[PDB]
Design a protein around this ligand. Structure first.
Ligand SMILES: [Ca+2]
Ligand SMILES: [Ca+2]
Ligand SMILES: [Ca+2]
Ligand SMILES: [Ca+2]
Ligand SMILES: [Ca+2]
Lengths: 6, 407
């Protein structure tokens, strides 16, 4: 579930 | 295959993606989302499920999540990404993913086709049978986002006949479809043994493991318990054993010694004695790996004057015989097994539509291309050709699309 926007 | 994509960062959204993973979670750096209308979406060379291996030279194969974030965030406007699709699939399915996929657009076009005077089945079929199964899941989500109604129920009201069966089948996930086909085979005053045997004998460990989990979510009961309720005798023992999906995994070493002993034990328990040691047959044929049992069946012919299939016809009868005959065919040549079942469903008067539909839906993304090779080689003409003669209308067209083409 670990979700980072780049 | 590793490939390279050049993204030009925009000040809004940067790359325009989300990522998951990292060596902290035993996962690579995978593209989680691709934001509509942003930098990565405009390249149209990136897909969800892609693993980012490098960014402007900086390796990311053993990078933590934060390490990958800092690397992607600190890169300049001109970004070169080394990307490889790490999502598993099958190269021998007939239905491939559509290359111009817009779930919202397909959802709207289907809604208009449902509400078009007389129902436009042609566009419903031409969309749904030309999308992958997970693309159909996205269309279903977008349909419920737009109309606030379930796509499956909306199509169930617009369609009828064998076309409704095909379309509603395509919408379910593979586990959901197998789970509901198994339930439909045991529900009612009887058991559709042929349908239960076809699914249980042909699915792999991984497929059965998901079926068992999904079957309990959908029906609040264990598949094994429903099997025990609808079957009896050795047939129950064989079905329960296979449905467990805990067959040994194909290892790297060939156990020649066990290959010979299994072949002897199959012979000793069957045509050498009077009667049959059915437990010995169930144990060997459900627990050994498939590559092992293929060699056992060739070694069996060294001891027996009849092959494994012929021996089954001499030893057992009824549903137990049918189960073993199906199981051995799936062990020996699974695509040929489905080619033969497809032939039987159409060769004679009328059509065994429930069988024809189930195979065309469930194997369309697994091994339909291998089924078609076996079919063409054995029967001389293509599966496509036999579907043409046996079905008509939009129903035929949908099956032809799931077939994928001629030969
Ligand atoms: Ca119509
Ligand atoms: Ca209907
Ligand atoms: Ca029943
Ligand atoms: Ca015997
Ligand atoms: Ca026919």
């Amino acid at each position: 579930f670990r979700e980072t926007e780049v | 295959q590793k490939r390279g994509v050049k993204v030009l960062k925009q000040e809004l959204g940067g790359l325009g993606i989300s990522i998951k993973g990292g060596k902290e979670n035993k996962m690579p750096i995978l593209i989680s989302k691709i934001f509509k209308g942003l930098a990565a979406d405009q390249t149209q060379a990136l897909y969800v499920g892609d693993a980012i291996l490098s960014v402007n030279g900086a390796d990311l194969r053993d990078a933590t999540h934060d390490e990958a974030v800092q690397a992607l965030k600190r890169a300049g406007k001109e970004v070169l990404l080394e990307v490889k699709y790490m999502r598993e699939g099958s190269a021998y399915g007939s239905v491939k993913a559509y290359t111009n996929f817009d779930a919202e657009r397909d959802a709207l076009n289907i809604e208009t086709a449902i509400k078009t005077k007389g129902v436009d089945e042609v566009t419903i079929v031409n969309i749904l049978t030309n999308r992958s199964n997970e693309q159909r899941q996205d269309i279903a989500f977008a349909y419920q986002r737009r109309t606030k109604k379930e796509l499956a129920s909306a199509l169930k009201s617009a369609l009828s006949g064998h076309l409704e069966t095909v379309i509603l089948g395509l919408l379910k996930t593979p586990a959901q479809y197998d789970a509901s086909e198994l339930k439909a085979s045991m529900k009612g005053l009887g058991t559709d043994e042929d349908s239960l045997i076809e699914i249980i004998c042909s699915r792999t460990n991984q497929e059965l493991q998901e079926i068992n989990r999904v079957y309990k979510e959908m029906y609040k009961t264990d598949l094994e318990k429903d099997i025990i309720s609808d079957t009896s005798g050795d047939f129950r023992k064989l079905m329960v054993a296979l449905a467990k999906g805990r067959r040994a995994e194909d290892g790297s070493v060939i156990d020649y010694e066990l290959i010979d002993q299994d072949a002897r034990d199959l012979y000793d328990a069957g045509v050498k004695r009077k009667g049959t040691d059915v437990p010995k047959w169930i144990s060997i044929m459900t627990e050994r790996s498939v590559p092992h049992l293929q060699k056992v069946f060739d070694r069996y012919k060294s001891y027996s004057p009849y092959d494994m299939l012929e021996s089954i016809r001499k030893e057992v009868k009824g549903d137990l015989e049918n189960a073993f005959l199906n199981l051995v065919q799936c062990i020996q040549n699974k695509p040929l097994y489905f080619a033969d079942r497809l032939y039987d469903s159409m060769k004679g008067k009328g059509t065994r539509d429930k069988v024809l539909i189930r195979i065309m839906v469930s194997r369309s993304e697994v091994d339909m291309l291998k089924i078609r090779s076996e079919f063409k080689r054995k029967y001389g003409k293509s599966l496509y050709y036999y579907i043409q003669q046996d079905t008509k209308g939009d129903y035929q067209k949908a099956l032809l699309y799931l077939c994928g083409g001629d030969d």
